[PDB]
């Protein structure tokens, strides 16, 4: 509260570390469905159904331009990518499997780097 603060957690490396994680996600072999924004002209249903599209290139641009205020807003956008993928894709599809694999991969790196 006013004039009463928990001890300062060092966040000075968060930007670099989120960039490293994102690089690892970009280079994963199962990243291909997620590298670029879904083409809203060419994929029926996407525009109406997925209210907040997100992809790794869009996260990279936000990261590089100071549009994440803290490491939690970064994780929210990464998870949005996978939540969108589960909304639109069957679990038993190449893309559906890719999204589960990538979510697992991300959540481990996240825990190991920050928790």
UniProtKB/Swiss-Prot annotation:
<protein>
    <recommendedName>
        <fullName>Bromodomain adjacent to zinc finger domain protein 2B</fullName>
    </recommendedName>
</protein>
<comment type="similarity">
    <text>Belongs to the WAL family.</text>
</comment>
<feature type="domain" description="Bromo">
    <location>
        <begin position="9"/>
        <end position="113"/>
    </location>
</feature>
<comment type="function">
    <text>Regulatory subunit of the ATP-dependent BRF-1 and BRF-5 ISWI chromatin remodeling complexes, which form ordered nucleosome arrays on chromatin and facilitate access to DNA during DNA-templated processes such as DNA replication, transcription, and repair. Both complexes regulate the spacing of nucleosomes along the chromatin and have the ability to slide mononucleosomes to the center of a DNA template. The BRF-1 ISWI chromatin remodeling complex has a lower ATP hydrolysis rate than the BRF-5 ISWI chromatin remodeling complex.</text>
</comment>
<comment type="subunit">
    <text>Component of the BRF-1 ISWI chromatin remodeling complex, at least composed of SMARCA1 and BAZ2B, which regulates the spacing of histone octamers on the DNA template to facilitate access to DNA. Within the BRF-1 ISWI chromatin remodeling complex interacts with SMARCA1; the interaction is direct. Component of the BRF-5 ISWI chromatin remodeling complex, at least composed of SMARCA5/SNF2H and BAZ2B, which regulates the spacing of histone octamers on the DNA template to facilitate access to DNA.</text>
</comment>
